[PDB]
Amino acid sequence: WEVPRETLKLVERLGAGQFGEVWMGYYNGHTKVAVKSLKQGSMSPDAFLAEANLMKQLQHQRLVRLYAVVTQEPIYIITEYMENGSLVDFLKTPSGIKLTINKLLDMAAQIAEGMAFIEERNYIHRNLRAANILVSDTLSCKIADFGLARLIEDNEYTARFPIKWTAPEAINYGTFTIKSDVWSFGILLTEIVTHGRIPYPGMTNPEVIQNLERGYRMVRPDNCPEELYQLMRLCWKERPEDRPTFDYLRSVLEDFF
């Protein structure tokens, strides 16, 4: 997986944040890639490279594909390039805003498909939200930053804490399982149908927490199909055992229309 830095030309910076940068570049002259580079001192090379190791372990059409790593300073992780960047941002563009419910649900289904694979392999995401989904030129969706031992923020590698996607038992006890990812997925569905609106709009993180102690659930978003809302409400059942599998979520979303 290790390559000489010479095999890579970084062309254009796509973002910079607290822990490093992401660039568009070319690999072996012809392959368009994205390159995540570590800012020295942010974390150890091993902590950074764990993300690459997880992409080695889990390969799937709905998961972001690893091409290579460079393990001398600055450390690089090299992946496939996704023309439409992060789903959370794409949804806010002219093209994104004009997507039909049909196409949005196809995208939700692809995300449930990738999560169904993670579930079947007995991994967890822990960081599931529209920010961590990448979108290709043909609107195919790929899950990034899965299986990490840590919770990530959106400003680490671009200019911009994810309490709003976190299930109650994870807030209260630090219990993270595939069922807390199912919770996060229900929140992600609200992002998809509102063309990228922040969850619990006009609540701060502490207010969300106070509301969840009282059993609060977001209302049906404007224009959201009622059946899709009922799917959301299943993802948000208080007890993790009452939440559906991703296998089921995928099957419902795939055949939705």
Ligand X SMILES: CN1CCN(c2cccc(-c3cnn4c3N=CC(c3ccc(O)cc3)[C@@H]4N)c2)CC1
By CB under 6 A, is residue 37 in contact with ligand X?
no
Of residues 121 through 180, those in contact with ligand X by CB under 6 A are 134, 144
Min separation Cβ 24 and ligand X, Å: 7
Scanning 74-82, 179-187, 193-201, 209-217 for contacts with ligand X by CB under 6 A, the matching segment is: 74-82
By CB under 6 A, is residue 51 in contact with ligand X?
yes
How far is CA 198 from its chain centroid?
14
Min separation Cβ 193 and ligand X, Å: 21
Min separation Cβ 152 and ligand X, Å: 11
Scanning 76-84, 121-129, 202-210, 244-252 for contacts with ligand X by CB under 6 A, the matching segment is: 76-84
Query: CB under 8 Å, gap of 24 or more: what pairs does 170-177 form?
Result: 171/209, 171/212, 176/124, 176/126, 177/124, 177/240
Among 25, 36, 69, 236, binds ligand X (CB under 6 A): 36
Min separation Cβ 86 and ligand X, Å: 6
Helix or strand run (H / E) with residue 9: strand 8-17
By CB under 6 A, is residue 34 in contact with ligand X?
yes
Among 19, 48, 81, 183, binds ligand X (CB under 6 A): 81
By CB under 6 A, is residue 64 in contact with ligand X?
yes
DSSP string over 41-78: TSS-HHHHHHHHHHHHH---TTBPPEEEEE-SSSPEEE
DSSP string over 142-208: EE-S-S-SS---TTSSS----GGG--HHHHHH----HHHHHHHHHHHHHHHHTTSPPSSTT--HHHH
Helix or strand run (H / E) with residue 22: strand 20-27
Of residues 191 through 250, those in contact with ligand X by CB under 6 A are none
Nearest to 37 by CA among 69, 80, 67, 3: 69
- Of the pair 86, 184, the CB lying nearest ligand X is at 86
Of residues 2 through 21, those in contact with ligand X by CB under 6 A are 14-15
Binding positions for ligand X, rule: CB under 6 A = 14-15, 22, 34, 36, 51, 64, 77, 79-86, 134, 144
